[PDB]
């Protein structure tokens, strides 16, 4: 088998992408952010307090004739940004882009923190990084990907993010069409759970490439770029006026600037991230302070390629016995 859905940019700076998802029976369309950094399919639904739900859509189970609560399960995660929510289990069929699990947990929101309440666009989560990550409680339970693995043709998933524009996930094949060269692939260590891997190193603009690992995480639930500190702040040495703001939270640039491209090494290959994927736009509406898309990863304990480096690739999750990571241009 394999499934093929588009992926939306929730808004104008590509701050997340939603992809729909059909939960139930009749099928209940949800808008899900996939996300190769955590391991939970969690839904805005019918038992989320209502004072936290504005404009989302919900899952209600109990019109899902094949929908079944898993008995005592629950659940709760908190995620890089601070963000958490929380709640109890159901199992039912849930389909992507004509791909079906039957049987896949889904986990029932009874809690959301506000940065979730306060996105409309966001109806959940559909967790990619591998199910050893998985919060429920006290059975934990697969992902999507890893119950639809054995049904699927070769066992994998893609990710061709859009830049200003819809993408693609696909599951159980590889579309030759979608990216130009080879595809690149590298190691990926499952130790912490992600989708782990190291960069051969970087290059600013049309400056030398730096020949230095990188350990990282592939992570579409991460929005921006976060790299070490010494990496980053040749970056933004590049750019006139930019500079860290403590007061901001990570490195601003004036909006008047044309940014440099960015690449990072994948093997001997070499991905680009073109200056304009790095615009983040202004600090607050009006402002012509600019927020940076490659940031220092200083503070959080990893790096992460979020979708500033992946929608410059086409990303292949290889789900075989020993995973790996595949990059190519497109």
Not at 49 to 72: H, R
Not at 136 to 155: G, R
Not at 224 to 252: D, H, I, N, R
Not at 285 to 308: E, L, M, P, W, Y
């Amino acid at each position: 088998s394999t499934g093929s859905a588009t992926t939306t940019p929730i808004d104008s700076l590509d701050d997340a992408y939603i992809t729909p998802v059909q939960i139930g029976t009749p099928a209940q369309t949800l808008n899900l952010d996939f996300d190769t950094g955590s391991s939970d399919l969690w839904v805005f639904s019918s038992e989320t307090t209502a004072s936290e739900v504005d404009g989302q859509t919900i899952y209600t189970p109990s019109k899902s004739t094949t929908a079944k609560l898993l008995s005592g399960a629950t659940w709760s995660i908190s995620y890089g940004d601070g963000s958490s929510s929380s709640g109890d289990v159901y199992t039912d069929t849930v389909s992507v882009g004509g791909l079906t699990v039957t049987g896949q947990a889904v986990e029932s929101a009874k809690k959301v923190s506000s940065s979730f309440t306060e996105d409309s666009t966001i109806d959940g989560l559909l967790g990619l990084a591998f199910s050893t990550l998985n919060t429920v409680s006290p059975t934990q339970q697969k992902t999507f990907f890893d119950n639809a693995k054995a049904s699927l043709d070769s066992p994998v998933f893609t990710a061709d993010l859009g830049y200003h524009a819809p993408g693609t996930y696909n599951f159980g094949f590889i579309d030759t069409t979608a990216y130009t060269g080879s595809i690149t692939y590298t190691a990926v260590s499952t130790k912490q759970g992600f989708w782990e891997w190291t960069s051969t190193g970087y290059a600013v603009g049309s400056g030398t490439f730096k020949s230095t690992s990188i350990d990282g995480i592939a992570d579409t639930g991460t929005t921006l770029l976060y790299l070490p500190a010494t990496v980053v702040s040749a970056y933004w040495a590049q750019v006139s006026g930019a500079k860290s703001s403590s007061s901001v939270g990570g490195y601003v640039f004036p909006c008047s600037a044309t940014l440099p491209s960015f690449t990072f090494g994948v093997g001997s290959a070499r991905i680009v991230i073109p200056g304009d994927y790095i615009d983040f736009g202004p600090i607050s509406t009006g402002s012509s302070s600019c927020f940076g898309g490659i940031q220092s990863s200083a503070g959080i304990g990893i790096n992460i390629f979020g979708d500033v480096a992946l929608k410059a690739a086409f990303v292949v999750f290889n789900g075989a016995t020993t995973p790996t990571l595949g990059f190519a241009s497109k």
